[PDB]
């Protein structure tokens with residue numbers, strides 16, 4: 001793909017200080033990952049921002065998905081359209097550690113990435129779900145074996161992540 005300006009972290013994990021929405025608009029990847037909740041209610045953070053960029057089409061599609069299939073599992077995922085941003089969106093639910101959900105489920109969440117050869121993705125559980133971002137990055141690197149391009153919006157956090165020893 002046309003991923004540009006990324007820093008290599010490992011054999012298969014690359015990182016960039018960017019809004020995942022802007023990266024998706026530029027690159028139009030096969031798969032963009034959403035940091036979803038089990039109800040696919042895309043209110044804020046990555047999910048709200050991706051949905052807004054689709055003019056709410058992501059939410060309309062998600063509502064039909066839930067009406068048919070019910071909620072996702074914590075640690076689970078589903079593949080839906082990427083609309084104008086990507087071919088597909090992999091909606092992945094990391095644990096909400098601020099609500100007592102088991103942080104071990106973060107590994108299960110990242111395992112979903114292994115079903116896709118290349119992904120543009122955020123750090124799961126590292127926003128309002130309250131997991132330590134360095135921990136989320138470590139779980140990502142230790143779990144995902146396919147090619148993952150991570151976008152981290154916050155500059156201060158990015159700078160910290162890339163100066164940390166995993």
Ligand SMILES: C[C@H]1CCCN(c2ncnc3[nH]ccc23)[C@H]1CO
Nearest residue numbers: 019020045046126127151152153154
């Ligand atoms: C570690 C993440 C926590 C959630 C929010 N973050 C985003 N990263 C990339 N693109 C994004 N778009 C909108 C939000 C957003 C990261 C922090 O900046």
